[PDB]
Amino acid sequence: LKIAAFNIRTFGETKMSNATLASYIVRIVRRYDIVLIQEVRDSHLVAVGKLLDYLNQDDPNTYHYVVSEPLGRNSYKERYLFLFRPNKVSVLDTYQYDDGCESCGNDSFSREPAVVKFSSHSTKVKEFAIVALHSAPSDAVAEINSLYDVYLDVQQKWHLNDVMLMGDFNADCSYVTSSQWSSIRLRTSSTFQWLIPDSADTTATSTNCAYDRIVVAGSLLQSSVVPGSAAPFDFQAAYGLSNEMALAISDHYPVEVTLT
Amino acid sequence: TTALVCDNGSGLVKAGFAGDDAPRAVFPSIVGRPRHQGVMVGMGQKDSYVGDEAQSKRGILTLKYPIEHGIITNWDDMEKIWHHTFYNELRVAPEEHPTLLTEAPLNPKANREKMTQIMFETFNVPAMYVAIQAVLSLYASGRTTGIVLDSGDGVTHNVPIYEGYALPHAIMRLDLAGRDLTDYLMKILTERGYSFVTTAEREIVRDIKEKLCYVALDFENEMATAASSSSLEKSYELPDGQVITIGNERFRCPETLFQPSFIGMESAGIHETTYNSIMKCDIDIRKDLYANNVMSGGTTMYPGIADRMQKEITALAPSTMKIKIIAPPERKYSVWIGGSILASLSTFQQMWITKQEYDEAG
Amino acid sequence: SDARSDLLSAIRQGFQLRRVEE
Ligand SMILES: Nc1ncnc2c1ncn2[C@@H]1O[C@H](COP(=O)(O)OP(=O)(O)OP(=O)(O)O)[C@@H](O)[C@H]1O
Ligand SMILES: *[C@@H]1O[C@H](CO)[C@@H](O[C@@H]2O[C@H](CO)[C@@H](O)[C@H](O)[C@H]2NC(C)=O)[C@H](O)[C@H]1NC(C)=O
Numbered sequence: 199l200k201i202a203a204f205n206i207r208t209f210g211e212t213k214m215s216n217a218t219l220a221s222y223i224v225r226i227v228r229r230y231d232i233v234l235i236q237e238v239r240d241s242h243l244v245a246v247g248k249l250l251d252y253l254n255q256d257d258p259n260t261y262h263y264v265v266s267e268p269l270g271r272n273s274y275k276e277r278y279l280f281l282f283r284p285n286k287v288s289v290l291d292t293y294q295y296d297d298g299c300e301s302c303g304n305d306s307f308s309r310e311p312a313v314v315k316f317s318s319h320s321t322k323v324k325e326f327a328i329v330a331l332h333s334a335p336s337d338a339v340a341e342i343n344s345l346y347d348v349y350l351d352v353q354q355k356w357h358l359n360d361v362m363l364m365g366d367f368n369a370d371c372s373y374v375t376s377s378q379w380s381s382i383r384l385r386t387s388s389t390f391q392w393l394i395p396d397s398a399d400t401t402a403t404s405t406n407c408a409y410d411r412i413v414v415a416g417s418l419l420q421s422s423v424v425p426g427s428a429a430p431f432d433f434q435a436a437y438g439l440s441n442e443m444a445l446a447i448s449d450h451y452p453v454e455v456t457l458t
Numbered sequence: 459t460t461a462l463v464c465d466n467g468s469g470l471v472k473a474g475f476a477g478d479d480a481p482r483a484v485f486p487s488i489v490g491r492p493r494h495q496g497v498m499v500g501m502g503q504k505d506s507y508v509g510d511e512a513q514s515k516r517g518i519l520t521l522k523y524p525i526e527h528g529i530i531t532n533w534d535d536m537e538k539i540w541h542h543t544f545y546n547e548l549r550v551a552p553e554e555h556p557t558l559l560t561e562a563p564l565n566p567k568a569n570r571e572k573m574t575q576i577m578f579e580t581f582n583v584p585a586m587y588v589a590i591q592a593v594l595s596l597y598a599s600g601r602t603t604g605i606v607l608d609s610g611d612g613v614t615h616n617v618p619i620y621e622g623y624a625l626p627h628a629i630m631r632l633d634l635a636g637r638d639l640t641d642y643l644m645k646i647l648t649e650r651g652y653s654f655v656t657t658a659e660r661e662i663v664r665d666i667k668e669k670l671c672y673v674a675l676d677f678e679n680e681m682a683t684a685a686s687s688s689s690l691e692k693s694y695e696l697p698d699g700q701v702i703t704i705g706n707e708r709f710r711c712p713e714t715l716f717q718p719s720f721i722g723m724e725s726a727g728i729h730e731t732t733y734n735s736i737m738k739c740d741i742d743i744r745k746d747l748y749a750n751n752v753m754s755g756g757t758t759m760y761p762g763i764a765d766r767m768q769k770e771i772t773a774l775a776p777s778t779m780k781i782k783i784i785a786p787p788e789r790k791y792s793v794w795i796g797g798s799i800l801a802s803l804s805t806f807q808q809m810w811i812t813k814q815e816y817d818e819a820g
Numbered sequence: 821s822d823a824r825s826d827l828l829s830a831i832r833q834g835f836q837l838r839r840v841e842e
């Protein structure tokens with residue numbers, strides 16, 4: 199099972215209408231059995247529907263979706279979108295973290311995590327949850343720390359220790375410095391393995407930053423990870439692209455991992 | 459015991475409770491089914507969406523308008539719309555409320571019978587009644603004789619009514635209304651150099667139409683005025699805060715109602731269909747139609763439209779004829795209001811068809 | 821002086837509708 203989290207800069211109608219950018223995005227998505235797409239700025243789900251139209255043009259059930267409403271604390275809103283291959287995994291339940299009141303999710307996250315429970319019969323782990331987060335850069339330390347509370351919420355809600363938490367956490371550089379890691383319970387708790395290391399470059403731009411991350415909890419799930427499989431997917435190199443064409447797709451690389 | 463009033467239009471459903479002065483639910487007459495399998499976070503798989511949520515989620519749906527040019531053309535979809543209306547919008551059990559429904563001028567009898575069968579057999583209403591939209595609008599103005607211009611999102615009709623009797627041989631139908639004017643405004647704004655590409659940009663055009671357009675009393679003079687000064691320009695601030703500025707598109711847009719050739723349609727304009735409708739009626743009631751021209755529907759809301767109709771009808775009619783256009787400020791909801799009044803009247807209570815009666819007839 | 825004459829006259833006299841707030 200191949201899983202990825204991909205921040206596609208301003209993913210939306212204009213990007214999906216560009217046949218060239220759409221073709222590269224389709225090619226990227228088709229690598230994966232589950233992929234989380236972030237930065238979905240798509241007021242009427244038109245770009246999402248167009249991506250699904252391409253993915254499903256041959257077989258109507260190639261990919262199924264889980265998508266959120268627009269999220270953000272002010273007028274600037276983004277959705278989380280999961281695309282998954284239903285012949286590989288099945289969605290058993292979903293919810294949006296809300297911390298106890300209909301608005302309180304926004305007290306700790308700008309974009310309240312989407313949480314999806316999957317049944318996965320081909321991997322060692324048979325059921326596992328994925329928690330998506332695109333953090334607010336200026337609140338990264340506090341939001342990554344709050345994922346620890348999301349993890350606790352999953353355990354209590356679903357009685358399940360096998361959880362992957364992933365996305366553009368902005369977890370490096372000026373937004374999380376080396377000294378700040380000790381403030382983040384998701385990092386200091388031995389419950390979690392960070393599969394994308396601080397040394398990784400997950401930007402398509404000239405910064406060298408491990409912004410995007412995959413964190414796994416639960417021993418079954420941890421035992422399911424293929425060693426060395428977790429890494430950014432440098433699509434500029436993969437597809438022999440110019441840097442300008444690369445940046446037009448996104449300013450981030452997907453981060454991916456394989457489960458057996 | 460409280461009656462419901464459901465006015466189903468080509469573009470909007472207006473629904474609510476008899477005796478209230480406005481509909482409580484107004485929403486798009488559209489049903490969408492997902493093109494792909496999946497869910498919204500926190501939700502189960504849904505088979506269809508109706509109304510506002512169908513519009514807001516349209517990108518992953520296939521949309522259908524069950525009412526075309528005022529007439530119901532898809533019954534499964536219309537059933538979804540009524541179900542949504544009752545249970546989701548009004549939040550009532552239709553089996554405990556007499557329900558008044560509206561229908562378009564010239565609606566075929568088989569269509570009204572099907573409407574009736576669904577209400578009784580599917581929704582199990584205790585009683586119901588089907589009223590002609592235009593006649594309700596006349597009633598809402600306190601009149602029982604007159605001629606109505608009803609112009610909505612999909613169709614425009616003229617309907618002369620004599621002592622409560624709509625005269626079907628004299629009804630005129632013009633397949634030009636609000637949706638056409640919205641599309642035309644998008645076109646002419648695009649020609650001026652604006653662009654409306656994304657769904658969100660395109661949706662703004664209907665708001666511009668509703669807030670900035672108006673009907674010129676003298677179109678050619680108004681075109682000259684827009685060309686010689688900036689006095690007719692008005693600004694519209696887009697969501698993002700960028701402010702744009704529009705001149706003659708403001709009145710060229712609804713001018714189409716008087717000159718359908720603006721959108722390539724070889725058809726009389728609304729002044730001439732009004733006059734043609736009056737002339738189909740007995741000469742001896744014409745004075746009463748001319749003096750009671752009632753405008754109804756969202757597409758009659760343009761500032762200036764009453765004065766312009768008064769001018770054009772005056773030019774067509776005998777020189778001594780008294781001509782009066784009645785354009786109530788509530789007229790976007792006139793049909794609904796007329797239904798709310800009628801269903802409330804004590805003198806109306808014997809006109810409901812009961813399920814008992816339906817159970818014995820057909 | 822039938823029911824329909826009665827109804828039309830009542831339509832003409834009007835009806836006090838309840839306010840629906842915004
Ligand atoms: N203030 C306004 N100015 C101009 N147009 C308006 C205004 N308000 C609403 N409209 C237009 O009115 C139309 C809706 O009117 P209405 O509800 O009477 O139509 P409908 O009953 O859905 O359709 P129809 O009667 O054609 O079947 C829409 O096209 C809308 O843009
Ligand atoms: C799809 O997106 C690509 C990438 O941004 C666009 O290609 C650019 O087009 C301009 C011309 O308008 C060139 O000057 C740039 O050099 C191109 N960029 C690259 C990296 O190739 C392309 O125009 C878009 N296609 C369409 C038709 O919208």
Ligand SMILES: [Ca+2]
Nearest residue numbers: 399401403405
């Ligand atoms: Ca980089």
Ligand SMILES: [Ca+2]
Nearest residue numbers: 467468591610
């Ligand atoms: Ca109507």
Ligand SMILES: [Mg+2]
Nearest residue numbers: 396397407408
């Ligand atoms: Mg680093």
